[PDB]
Design a protein around this ligand. Structure first.
Ligand SMILES: [Pr+3]
Length: 228
């Protein structure tokens, strides 16, 4: 019963900040990040009512989600980690949403595979909001132009923008910049806010937050839970 309690608390926390910010809890999607957790640990979350999940790696996802999806028909799986061009095919075959379009090469790859597989997924363009040399993502200054490229030239539908700000600084400006860019791109969806800042993210307009440990517990905790 720990999972149900944790999930309800997360949803309640989302609702509290949403309402405080003048928004509806319904406006914020909760993506349960299941990275590092096996199918056995994930099922309890699905049983608790969760349908939207996120995985950082295609390979890890391939090993556990197929069985989970044939068991539960309405799963919405998001790829929230970097994608190598040689895994694009596998990703298009398994995921419903790919939030990591961080460069031209992968946008093209995703575009061709959707075509080759007769599929139409949902996509987010990842922005390197702080322009950190060590981080992936489109330059904020080239984002508007990049989204036009995806939508017009690659005929790749783009749902919104996504970011993962540097952990050692205030998320505020990063979220605010992403919101601004989204408006300039004519996009209404924003994937920002993770484990330690999803509440602040909602305050800046986040429409989708990625929460992992708060739902599953840490690796140690979760396994402790699944003893009885
Ligand atoms: Pr309850």
């Amino acid at each position: 019963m720990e999972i149900e309690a944790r999930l309800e608390d997360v949803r309640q926390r989302i609702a509290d900040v949403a309402e405080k910010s003048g928004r509806k809890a319904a406006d914020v999607a909760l993506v349960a990040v299941s990275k590092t957790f096996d199918a056995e640990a994930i099922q309890p979350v699905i049983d608790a009512g969760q349908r939207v999940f996120g995985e950082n790696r295609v390979q890890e996802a391939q090993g556990k989600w197929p069985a989970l999806k044939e068991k539960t028909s309405d799963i919405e799986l998001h790829l929230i980690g970097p994608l190598q061009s040689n895994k694009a095919a596998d990703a298009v075959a398994l995921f419903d949403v790919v939030e990591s379009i961080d460069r031209e090469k992968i946008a093209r790859a995703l575009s061709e595979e959707c075509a080759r597989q007769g599929r139409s997924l949902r996509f987010y363009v990842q922005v390197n909001t702080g322009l950190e040399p060590q981080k992936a993502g489109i330059d904020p200054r080239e984002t508007v132009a990049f989204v036009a490229f995806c939508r017009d030239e690659l005929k790749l539908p783009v749902e919104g923008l996504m970011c993962i700000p540097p952990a050692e600084e205030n998320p505020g400006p990063h979220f605010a910049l992403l919101a601004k860019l989204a408006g300039q791109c004519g996009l209404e969806k924003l994937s920002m806010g993770m484990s330690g800042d999803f509440e602040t993210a909602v305050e800046f307009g986040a429409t989708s937050v990625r929460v992992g440990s708060a739902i599953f517990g840490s690796r140690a905790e979760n396994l402790y839970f699944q003893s009885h």
